[PDB]
Amino acid sequence: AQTVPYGIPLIKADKVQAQGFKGANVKVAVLDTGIQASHPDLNVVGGASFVAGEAYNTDGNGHGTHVAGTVAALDNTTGVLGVAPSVSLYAVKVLNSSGSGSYSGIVSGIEWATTNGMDVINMSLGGASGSTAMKQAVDNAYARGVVVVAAAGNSGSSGNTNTIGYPAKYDSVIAVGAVDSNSNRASFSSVGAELEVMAPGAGVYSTYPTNTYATLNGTSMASPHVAGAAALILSKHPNLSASQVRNRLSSTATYLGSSFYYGKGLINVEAAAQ
Amino acid sequence: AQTVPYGIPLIKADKVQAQGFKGANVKVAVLDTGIQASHPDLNVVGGASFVAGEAYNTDGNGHGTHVAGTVAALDNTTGVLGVAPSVSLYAVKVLNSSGSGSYSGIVSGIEWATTNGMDVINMSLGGASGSTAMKQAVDNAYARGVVVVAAAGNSGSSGNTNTIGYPAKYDSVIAVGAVDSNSNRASFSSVGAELEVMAPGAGVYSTYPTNTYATLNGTSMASPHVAGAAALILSKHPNLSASQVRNRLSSTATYLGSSFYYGKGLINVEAAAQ
Amino acid sequence: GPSAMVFTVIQGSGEPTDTVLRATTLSCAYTAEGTHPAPRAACDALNATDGELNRLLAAPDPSLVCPMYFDPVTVTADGVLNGRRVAWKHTFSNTCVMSANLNSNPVYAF
Amino acid sequence: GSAHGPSAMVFTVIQGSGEPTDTVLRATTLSCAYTAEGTHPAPRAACDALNATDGELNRLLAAPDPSLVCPMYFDPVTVTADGVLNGRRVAWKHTFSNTCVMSANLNSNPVYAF
Ligand SMILES: OC[C@@H](O)COC[C@H](O)CO
Numbered sequence: 001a002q003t004v005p006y007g008i009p010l011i012k013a014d015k016v017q018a019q020g021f022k023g024a025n026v027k028v029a030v031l032d033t034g035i036q037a038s039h040p041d042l043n044v045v046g047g048a049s050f051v052a053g054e055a056y057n058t059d060g061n062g063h064g065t066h067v068a069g070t071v072a073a074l075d076n077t078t079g080v081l082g083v084a085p086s087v088s089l090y091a092v093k094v095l096n097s098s099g100s101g102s103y104s105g106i107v108s109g110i111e112w113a114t115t116n117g118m119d120v121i122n123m124s125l126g127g128a129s130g131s132t133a134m135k136q137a138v139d140n141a142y143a144r145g146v147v148v149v150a151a152a153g154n155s156g157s158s159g160n161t162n163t164i165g166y167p168a169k170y171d172s173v174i175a176v177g178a179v180d181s182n183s184n185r186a187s188f189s190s191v192g193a194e195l196e197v198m199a200p201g202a203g204v205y206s207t208y209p210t211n212t213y214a215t216l217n218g219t220s221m222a223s224p225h226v227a228g229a230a231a232l233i234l235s236k237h238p239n240l241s242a243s244q245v246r247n248r249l250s251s252t253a254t255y256l257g258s259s260f261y262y263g264k265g266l267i268n269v270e271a272a273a274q
Numbered sequence: 275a276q277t278v279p280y281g282i283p284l285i286k287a288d289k290v291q292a293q294g295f296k297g298a299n300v301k302v303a304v305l306d307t308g309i310q311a312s313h314p315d316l317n318v319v320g321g322a323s324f325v326a327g328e329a330y331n332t333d334g335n336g337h338g339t340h341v342a343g344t345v346a347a348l349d350n351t352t353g354v355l356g357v358a359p360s361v362s363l364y365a366v367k368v369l370n371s372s373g374s375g376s377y378s379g380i381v382s383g384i385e386w387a388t389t390n391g392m393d394v395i396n397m398s399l400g401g402a403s404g405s406t407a408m409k410q411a412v413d414n415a416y417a418r419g420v421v422v423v424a425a426a427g428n429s430g431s432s433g434n435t436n437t438i439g440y441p442a443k444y445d446s447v448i449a450v451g452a453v454d455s456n457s458n459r460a461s462f463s464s465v466g467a468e469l470e471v472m473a474p475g476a477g478v479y480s481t482y483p484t485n486t487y488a489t490l491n492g493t494s495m496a497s498p499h500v501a502g503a504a505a506l507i508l509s510k511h512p513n514l515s516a517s518q519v520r521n522r523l524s525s526t527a528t529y530l531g532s533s534f535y536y537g538k539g540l541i542n543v544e545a546a547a548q
Numbered sequence: 549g550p551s552a553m554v555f556t557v558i559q560g561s562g563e564p565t566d567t568v569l570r571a572t573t574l575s576c577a578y579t580a581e582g583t584h585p586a587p588r589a590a591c592d593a594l595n596a597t598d599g600e601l602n603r604l605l606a607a608p609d610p611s612l613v614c615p616m617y618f619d620p621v622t623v624t625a626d627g628v629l630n631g632r633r634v635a636w637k638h639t640f641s642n643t644c645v646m647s648a649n650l651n652s653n654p655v656y657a658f
Numbered sequence: 659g660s661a662h663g664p665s666a667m668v669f670t671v672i673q674g675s676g677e678p679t680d681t682v683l684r685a686t687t688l689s690c691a692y693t694a695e696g697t698h699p700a701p702r703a704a705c706d707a708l709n710a711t712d713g714e715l716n717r718l719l720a721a722p723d724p725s726l727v728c729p730m731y732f733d734p735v736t737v738t739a740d741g742v743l744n745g746r747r748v749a750w751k752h753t754f755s756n757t758c759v760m761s762a763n764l765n766s767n768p769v770y771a772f
């Protein structure tokens with residue numbers, strides 16, 4: 001009863017998995033509303049919580065479980081299939097049950113990920129202005145070899161206005177926009193010079209609490225595809241640096257139009273993991 | 275300091291006045307908000323009031339004075355010039371100070387005009403449904419030799435919908451539509467099978483209380499041009515019947531397009547009074 | 549359902565730059581509220597339209613006539629009508645025609 | 659600057675992008691004349707904020723909370739403003755990606771505190 005979401009063959013993650021590279025031994029931190037660790041299609045092996053009275057391995061919202069399942073839903077006979085199903089998945093709870101998080105909470109999560117040897121940080125979240133503490137946290141993670149990925153934002157387009165949010169707008173972070181099953185830009189996908197790559201973000205079917213599945217839209221859904229793609233590359237070529245993995249993802253992306261709207265284009269993990 | 279409004283040469287009233295026919299001895303009743311009789315450019319020689327508390331020779335609105343000036347504004351060295359400046363002008367107050375009038379009030383005014391030997395009735399007013407007493411009053415006026423003229427209405431056009439109001443819609447009344455200085459139909463001018471003739475009704479400069487002048491738009495401004503034109507014909511050919519005067523005005527009108535929108539066309543009093 | 553409305557009378561045919569002559573607010577919830585001078589009567593007349601504001605023009609005065617000068621005036625209604633968003637307008641050839649067609653309807657008695 | 663003249667407004671919060679069929683979540687009325695009136699719970703603060711926008715309601719989004727982040731899932735919520743704003747007719751709307759983003763961007767602004 002396993003369903004393959006359209007995004008896994010669209011980014012050509014199925015081709016890399018067919019080679020035998022599934023993210024094994026790669027540590028991916030999902031900085032979000034936590035993850036329902038008891039979900040039969042997910043395997044959470046650690047993490048931390050920077051939210052009040054919530055454990056890292058629970059998700060009272062659902063967003064974090066959905067994002068995690070796009071990266072890591074298990075290759076079995078149930079539910080869905082993640083981009084990198086064999087990754088070492090870590091739940092870093094930085095957003096509360098209502099989805100809200102503070103800059104200091106995000107900073108605490110990024111620093112945890114850097115100190116605990118994470119290979120990839122996924123941040124399906126955004127703020128309008130950023131901070132010196134937040135810039136410092138993402139710059140240090142990337143300088144210390146972490147591939148840092150974030151949702152570009154869901155602020156759409158208005159003339160030539162740059163609508164990329166933070167942390168995606170920082171140069172040390174991969175800003176991920178959203179395309180649909182036809183590789184067409186989702187109208188809500190943020191635009192600007194920092195838009196780096198696109199990934200599926202419309203009608204993304206993934207894991208959801210409690211022990212179920214849901215279809216969601218957002219650059220939040222696009223971002224874990226690129227996080228998972230980074231893990232596939234690293235499971236095949238573990239000695240590549242974070243900038244080398246990042247440059248493979250942007251260099252081999254399928255051109256879809258103007259970089260203002262699409263960045264380098266839709267990621268192609270088959271070409272990126274060559 | 276006398277100004278000739280564009281409407282006087284457009285309907286060719288200046289040509290008839292040049293022949294020496296100016297409406298002398300012709301009685302024209304203006305059924306309206308009254309007339310400012312003390313206006314230096316108007317000579318009100320009689321009338322009646324069917325508005326309680328108000329006198330016929332006063333106009334607390336302004337509409338009646340404007341309409342009257344298009345008919346009968348004096349040929350002198352001040353203000354404007356009427357279509358028929360030598361007419362015997364009668365103020366029949368049927369509309370109050372606020373412009374409102376009742377069907378019974380209009381009926382009282384039409385009957386007054388019929389009994390007091392008026393040659394022409396002008397009714398720059400309209401209602402949506404009419405009344406049986408109103409139909410009877412205008413049929414009797416026309417049967418007894420009064421030329422009965424009314425504003426077609428300002429309800430515009432909508433597909434093939436007939437938007438002509440009452441009393442203009444009655445067969446015994448001349449329904450007058452509005453054209454501009456270019457002889458183009460004014461967008462607000464009512465349409466339908468009863469539309470008989472057109473006359474200037476956009477940017478019509480005329481007398482206004484107190485002792486002043488104003489520019490107004492409406493089939494209200496168009497109707498007095500045809501009332502005045504009827505008076506010119508009767509001052510030149512006094513033994514013509516009301517139906518003969520009416521038939522001369524529609525038979526000699528300048529064709530401007532489809533009768534639904536323009537009736538027989540723009541009146542030409544030079545050709546009508548030949 | 550509840551209502552939260554703004555009614556205006558504007559000089560013109562309903563253009564965005566048209567001069568506002570008068571405006572009022574009306575709320576129909578637990579009670580009839582707003583800056584409307586007769587909120588109870590206005591809510592009752594509002595609910596009577598059954599979501600169709602053109603029914604406010606359904607009872608014109610059958611005995612009145614107006615001068616045929618054209619100076620358009622437009623009535624507007626915007627907000628929530630019985631739980632549903634509305635943006636409605638109606639133009640009259642002059643204020644006399646407006647007054648006669650609305651015939652003292654409580655909604656535009658402000 | 660700041661705007662002058664009377665205001666008579668209806669503010670709503672709707673589920674969606676601003677389509678006419680969109681479900682109303684909440685609505686309120688506000689009158690700004692000699693006194694601040696309406697069913698709005700804080701009329702004087704709401705009028706003061708409105709007048710301060712100087713006829714430009716996009717200025718209600720000019721002070722977002724600088725310390726908050728939101729999840730980037732798209733489930734649109736729209737704020738609307740209709741009526742007379744300082745003597746001028748207005749029909750304004752703003753769509754937020756989700757309710758978290760709305761809350762953070764509006765940052766307890768008195769106009770949408772209803
Ligand atoms: O695959 C084992 C990882 O812990 C090594 O990666 C370390 C990373 O570059 C620093 O966070």
Ligand SMILES: C[As](C)(=O)[O-]
Pocket residue numbers: 660661662663713744745
């Ligand atoms: C809208 As104002 C009269 O303050 O310019």
Ligand SMILES: [Ca+2]
Pocket residue numbers: 002041073074075076077078079080081
């Ligand atoms: Ca599975």
Ligand SMILES: [Ca+2]
Pocket residue numbers: 167168169170171172173174175194
């Ligand atoms: Ca970036």
Ligand SMILES: [Ca+2]
Pocket residue numbers: 276315347348349350351352353354355
């Ligand atoms: Ca004169």
Ligand SMILES: [Ca+2]
Pocket residue numbers: 441442443444445446447448449468470
């Ligand atoms: Ca007729």
Ligand SMILES: [Cl-]
Pocket residue numbers: 061062063731
């Ligand atoms: Cl959710």
Ligand SMILES: [K+]
Pocket residue numbers: 751752753
């Ligand atoms: K906007």
Ligand SMILES: [K+]
Pocket residue numbers: 719763
């Ligand atoms: K915004």
Ligand SMILES: [Zn+2]
Pocket residue numbers: 237273274
């Ligand atoms: Zn290779």
Ligand SMILES: [Zn+2]
Pocket residue numbers: 660661662
């Ligand atoms: Zn001002």
